[PDB]
Amino acid sequence: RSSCFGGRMDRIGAQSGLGCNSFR
Amino acid sequence: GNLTVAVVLPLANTSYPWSWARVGPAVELALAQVKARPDLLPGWTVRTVLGSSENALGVCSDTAAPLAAVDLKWEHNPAVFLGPGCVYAAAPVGRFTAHWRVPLLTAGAPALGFGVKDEYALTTRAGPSYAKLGDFVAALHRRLGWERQALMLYAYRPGDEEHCFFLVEGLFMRVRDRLNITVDHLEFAEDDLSHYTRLLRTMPRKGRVIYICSSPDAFRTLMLLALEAGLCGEDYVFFHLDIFGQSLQGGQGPAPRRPWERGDGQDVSARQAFQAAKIITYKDPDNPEYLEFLKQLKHLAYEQFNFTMEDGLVNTIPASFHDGLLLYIQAVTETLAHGGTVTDGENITQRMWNRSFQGVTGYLKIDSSGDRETDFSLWDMDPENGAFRVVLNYNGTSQELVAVSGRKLNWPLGYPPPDIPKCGF
Amino acid sequence: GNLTVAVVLPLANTSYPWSWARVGPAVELALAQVKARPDLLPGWTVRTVLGSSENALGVCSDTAAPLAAVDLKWEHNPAVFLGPGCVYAAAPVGRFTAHWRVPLLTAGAPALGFGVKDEYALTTRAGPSYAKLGDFVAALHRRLGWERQALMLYAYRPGDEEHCFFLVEGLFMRVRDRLNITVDHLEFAEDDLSHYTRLLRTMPRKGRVIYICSSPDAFRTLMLLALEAGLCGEDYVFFHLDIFGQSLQGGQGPAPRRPWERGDGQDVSARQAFQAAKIITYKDPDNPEYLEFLKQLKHLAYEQFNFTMEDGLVNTIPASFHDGLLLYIQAVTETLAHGGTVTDGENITQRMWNRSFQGVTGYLKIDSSGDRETDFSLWDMDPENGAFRVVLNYNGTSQELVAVSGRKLNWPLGYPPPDIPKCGF
Ligand SMILES: *[C@@H]1O[C@H](CO)[C@@H](O[C@@H]2O[C@H](CO)[C@@H](O)[C@H](O[C@H]3O[C@H](CO)[C@@H](O)[C@H](O)[C@@H]3O)[C@H]2NC(C)=O)[C@H](O)[C@H]1NC(C)=O
Ligand SMILES: *[C@@H]1O[C@H](CO)[C@@H](O[C@@H]2O[C@H](CO)[C@@H](O)[C@H](O)[C@H]2NC(C)=O)[C@H](O)[C@H]1NC(C)=O
Ligand SMILES: *[C@@H]1O[C@H](CO)[C@@H](O[C@@H]2O[C@H](CO)[C@@H](O)[C@H](O)[C@H]2NC(C)=O)[C@H](O)[C@H]1NC(C)=O
Ligand SMILES: *[C@@H]1O[C@H](CO)[C@@H](O[C@@H]2O[C@H](CO)[C@@H](O)[C@H](O)[C@H]2NC(C)=O)[C@H](O)[C@H]1NC(C)=O
Ligand SMILES: *[C@@H]1O[C@H](CO)[C@@H](O)[C@H](O)[C@H]1NC(C)=O
Ligand SMILES: [Cl-]
Ligand SMILES: [Cl-]
């Protein structure tokens, strides 16, 4: 895994793009 | 004896590649082929019990699929689950059936997290996976002399179930454990025109080999803006991860596609912006046994579900469900012939993994970790008429690229641009 | 009649704040009080049915929690769920009970996604939530005059269920909503030194006000390197988001703390390294009934579960379960008074939300969104003996940041440093 990929496939951790590169 | 198959798929919504409208007919063809073959479950009966995986809103949900699966188990005691297709629906059901020690067949659930076979210990994936698109990109890099750096962009659209996030996740996490390249990602928002400008201002200093997962219109807009900005393709190459070939009107069959034409008026400047763009897509099986399967599939989809199938690569999920169910039945015959039980679960799956099988889609290969070896194809433009076509197929079991009918990739300079300019950004 | 209460908590692992070893006697004191109050639920009894939310490995799980909840729901018909604490275990049960329309009380599950209330409908959080930390931080920023930048760092450790990720996510989202401030985020591994070195090398370029979520002994090796690199306290402030006061032996008392003291040979440099560091914890209730409740709770925890409760600040989660269950009982009592029923989930719930209460943790107030209003505390160093003690209590009900009498924030320059350096980044 990295700071963005390789987590759990639950919708609870997808609320914020924290740790990922994003424009939003 | 009775072998019960539990289906947790979208029953009413017919917009998903794994909807019961499309998968339903295919499971009917398969289950009649085991009944017509004496050498497959001799004298046993196969019955299907249906459970939905969608809300009252008609969208596949992570809270309706687990509860439907629990009800199905309590009321029928299935031998196997035909499995959800959605990532968030399939995750909890995958874990649940792992705990119950019952297999789970599914041509969906392509996310990267299902490859952790210490949690989804029994999940067999008979369809395409997003992790196996990263070893296609690795071979593509090796063939074209790319060993330093790349860039990957995925787009956010509220409606979809984070499709491009997962696709780029698999691609990124697989193409940097078997390559020594530096890959960096970035996310923008679809149809936020202020994001494309920032994306163009960023891209020149981040990479020269770019992989974009977006909708066809977003890709066309990005290509036009890149052409305006001067990213002319003598030093850039953009790859469009269009798995189902929705920019190519389904991507199935030999026919000029020209995916840059929409009558918008600016389809003349959208033609030279696509001469530095390749498209990555699932491979269409060319078997004579596959085209005969689609015909009766479409017929019986119209007869029994009032749904009219449109050609395209999105039809390889019904066929993958067909092949997976046939593989499961053939592996359950051998478990009985050896003095086993139809409810082993653990012994049945190991007779499915690291095994190669002949189905309508071709000669399958279920790798030793459960997933099925996927084939992709590369499309590029023809300078003569400017129409895209398949130019390079990738066989996922032998892991080697194959050219098509003497077709050479159309590079504006003749050879691929480097992934780092002469004066490194 | 009888009012069943379904419990989904770790019934065998005594290392979680919300572990039935700790919470177990907390709800027994609550249920022993309604029996002593004729004016609470007069003509009914209350029962507890326990389901575990633990793997066979002995940790919270997102496959055992929902399955235990389903078994409890179908075997017994509950009136409420005392709910899991672990976020990844509480999410599935939250959705399940929202579908069944059964209220879910929980002093854990602090993640930000539990507050949507279009998904987790009928979920009253009677304990701390990470979003409410953003309110405290915003009040801090408005008070100390810095309203233009901040940097937040969360450390990654394989063991903990991404505690710091969720904490910093809640703080980040809430601050971004409360302040027109630009913030950065970053993740560093917890157990390697290259990450610390690169972090210190790239910290001076991204902010001067830093919030760190990490282990108590990894914020001290960061403070030593920062001192060695010249990042004195004139320019920087380092906030340690230690919500449960691990770095302060719990922080449940008025004694001096000395979090920089280890006696390992470099205990002198650490004292001037911590002169630039503040610590943010939860607020320990100051009412006598909380102390009496702790005195009873630890005796009962030892005398019924063979567990020696530690004297710390992690005991406000048991007290939160106690107060939340008493509040639920009051609400259902009111509902029964007005010709209601135990099974009116929505009507029982709507009387809990948006109203104050008097428990053992003080005078409560549950926001109109269903989440209790959290009180925080801020520690600082004494210039004389270098001992840490509280200087600013924050009241979440009125959002008032009130300083302790006789204490004040001590800055090296006499006033808070800027968040943007005068010269520039
Ligand atoms: C945090 O802030 C609140 C103020 O918002 C503090 O005081 C409480 O304020 C409410 C008004 O919002 C008072 O009602 C409450 O005291 C009365 O509450 C009920 C109201 O009917 C009454 O019956 C009681 O007898 C009492 O007179 C205030 N709290 C107390 C204990 O009286 C609150 O204390 C602050 N918390 C901390 C830890 O400082
Ligand atoms: C069938 O499913 C599709 C999902 O592909 C639904 O379309 C989505 O509907 C939601 C509303 O719940 C929107 O937020 C999304 O933006 C929609 N996405 C797309 C791609 O359209 C569709 O509404 C469903 N229809 C039926 C009849 O069930
Ligand atoms: C991809 O390559 C594999 C092998 O490299 C091909 O698999 C062979 O298929 C034939 C067809 O019956 C078998 O008899 C062989 O034994 C297979 N080879 C093996 C198992 O090593 C496969 O056909 C190729 N894919 C395509 C589309 O041609
Ligand atoms: C109790 O739970 C704790 C979790 O807080 C367990 O400790 C973790 O165990 C996992 C694997 O079991 C490790 O990956 C973590 O590093 C551990 N974290 C620690 C030790 O802080 C513990 O094993 C459980 N014990 C029992 C008896 O249930
Ligand atoms: C919540 O309570 C307050 C008073 O405590 C009241 O004024 C308000 O109307 C209630 N409902 C809300 C804020 O939605
Ligand atoms: Cl599904
Ligand atoms: Cl739990």
How far the N terminus sits from the C terminus of chain B, by CA atoms, comes to: 68 Å
**Which protein chains make the most extensive interface, counting residues with beta carbons within 8 Å of the other chain's beta carbons?**
A-B, 17 and 23 residues
> What sort of overall outline of chain B do the alpha carbons produce when their principal axes are compared?
elongated
CATH topology of the largest domain in chain B: Rossmann fold
The number of E-state strands of chain A comes to 0
Q: Kindly report the spatial arrangement of strands forming the biggest sheet of chain B.
A: 7-6-8-9-10-13-14-15
Site (Cleavage) (chain A): 4-5
Region (Important for degradation of atrial natriuretic peptide by IDE) (chain A): 21-24
Modified residues (Phosphoserine) (chain A): 3
Organism (chain A): Homo sapiens (Human)
Structure description:
Chain A has 24 residues and is mostly loops. Chain A contains no helices and no strands. The relative contact order of chain A is 0.31. Chain B is an alpha/beta fold and 425 residues long. Chain B has 2 domains: 2-128 and 287-366, Rossmann fold, CATH 3.40.50; 132-284 and 375-403, Rossmann fold, CATH 3.40.50. Chain B has 10 helices and 15 strands. Chain B has helices spanning 20-33, 65-76, 87-100, 134-143, 163-174, 193-202, 216-229, 288-305, 316-337, 346-350, and strands at residues 2-8, 45-51, 80-81, 104-106, 123-125, 149-156, 182-189, 209-213, 237-241, 277-282, 355-359, 362-366, 376-381, 388-395, 400-403. In chain B, a hairpin with a 2-residue loop joins strand 11 and strand 12. In chain B, helix 1 (20-33) packs across helix 8 (288-305). The termini of chain B are far apart. The A-B interface holds A 1-2, 4-11, 14, 17, 20-24 and B 62, 87-88, 91, 111-114, 156, 162, 169, 172-173, 184-189, 192, 195, 198-199. The complex binds a molecule of 3 linked components (NAG-NAG-MAN), a molecule of 2 linked components (NAG-NAG) (3 copies), 2-acetamido-2-deoxy-beta-D-glucopyranose and chloride ion (2 copies). A molecule of 2 linked components (NAG-NAG) binds at residues 13, 15, 57-59, 158-159 of chain B. 2-acetamido-2-deoxy-beta-D-glucopyranose binds at residues 354, 368 of chain C. Chains B, C: GO terms for molecular function: ATP binding; G protein-coupled peptide receptor activity; GTP binding; guanylate cyclase activity; hormone binding; natriuretic peptide receptor activity; peptide hormone binding; peptide receptor activity. Chains B, C: It comes from Homo sapiens (Human). Chains B, C: One of its GO terms (cellular component) is receptor complex. Chains B, C: Homodimer.
